[PDB]
Design a protein around this ligand. Sequence first.
Ligand SMILES: NC(=O)[C@H]1CCCN(C(=O)C2(n3cccn3)CCCC2)C1
Ligand SMILES: [Zn+2]
Length: 140
Amino acid sequence: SGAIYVGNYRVVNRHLATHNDWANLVWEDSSRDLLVSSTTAQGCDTIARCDCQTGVYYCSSRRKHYPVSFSKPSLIFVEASEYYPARYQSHLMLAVGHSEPGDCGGILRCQHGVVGIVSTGGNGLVGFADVRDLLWLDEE
Ligand SMILES: NC(=O)[C@H]1CCCN(C(=O)C2(n3cccn3)CCCC2)C1
Ligand SMILES: [Zn+2]
């Protein structure tokens, strides 16, 4: 689990969104595994606006932050699970790292701020849903 809190927005994995998230919905995209809801209190996270390919992510199943090299946001296959059928997930970045159930929502960050959240695992792979192109998170 985990979320990004920027301005009056809460960014979570779409597959982990609560009823309160859906009842206060700003935007959602199943192809990206992302959902944004509105918040009463202002958050402290800042979004990175960059093309970094190195950063650090939080792994809840290890209670550890790991430095990683990650790929550019792309259209990657995610093998069926109980959340989405076989398909292609967009705006996804992969790294070698550990990711196992209980781990989505962990933040990936670079020197500029938050880059995205854990969206995949298995295989000694970590997938992150990028948020750096969502410029509207910084305003209104
Ligand atoms: N983005 C998605 O489509 C993911 C939704 C949750 C399930 N997905 C995964 O990658 C699995 N996972 C690894 C670490 C955490 N979850 C792989 C093994 C079992 C579940 C796919
Ligand atoms: Zn950066």
